[PDB]
Symmetry: C3
Subunit: 110 residues, 3 copies
């Protein structure tokens, strides 16, 4: 899976090693080996979320595993909200998740 996290929290306000903890959390939540988990964190951005510039985060999750129903992703979403609210001290209203399906041909390795 590919996780991309954008936040308007300054880089020096984002907990040290967040990318490592989100990698390990995503492997457990998604039921994927950690050696197939990828995390990118982009802090210090200018962001409005739901019309507001209070601290926020946007998480994108792209995977071959993504099934096009909410019920299929709802448990995963809840886990990622729990993860980010505790790590970044954000309210649930200050996080949004987007899920994107991928097919194997899209991924270039080696």
């Amino acid at each position: 899976p590919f996780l991309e996290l954008d936040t308007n929290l300054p880089a020096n306000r984002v907990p040290a090693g967040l990318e490592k903890r989100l990698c390990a959390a995503a492997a457990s939540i998604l039921g994927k080996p950690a050696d197939r988990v990828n995390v990118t964190v982009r802090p210090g951005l200018a962001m409005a979320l739901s019309g507001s510039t209070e601290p926020c985060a946007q998480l994108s999750i792209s995977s071959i595993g993504v099934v096009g129903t909410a019920e299929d992703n709802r448990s995963h979403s809840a886990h990622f909200f729990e993860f980010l609210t505790k790590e970044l001290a954000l309210g649930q209203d200050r996080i949004l998740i987007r899920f994107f399906p991928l097919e194997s041909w899209q991924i270039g390795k080696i």
Copy 2:
């Protein structure tokens, strides 16, 4: 809607509060409530646009509203070019917009 703006303008050259004005402009242009508008601005990047490293911006617009025709998005595109040319003092040739359709199941809230 989700707007993401990449620019090679340094963060301290991007007008203060651009994310707030682009949020309000997008709500008006797209005909969506501002409490459903999300804007991310990533400045200070290294960018080439149309083969050139003059100042530029790339805007991505993702929404449940996106209809897969140019005629459907042409009025919106024109408004966003007017917005960015005036805010960032860019020529029309130094902006590109990409539109992406979303479905409701892709968006994780609460």
Copy 3:
């Protein structure tokens, strides 16, 4: 084409003008005029790739040219791995490429 490169290499560790060389390389690899090639480089990010926070890069390639088979993109992928390994002194295991198809209606110009 639209290329987006994320890396955890600090901005001052990324070779000067990488965006220009990747633009020119992409035009040659993809067989597209350089005036239709767009490159965004986002350095200094926090990243894990394949579970690890060693230096890495993620490259996304979006184009009207993208055919949904690996065999169609395998030669391009190999060229981009050769390009990034030499520019960023990364091992082949520290790069991943994602390919995304676009249609003309998605691109707002003028």
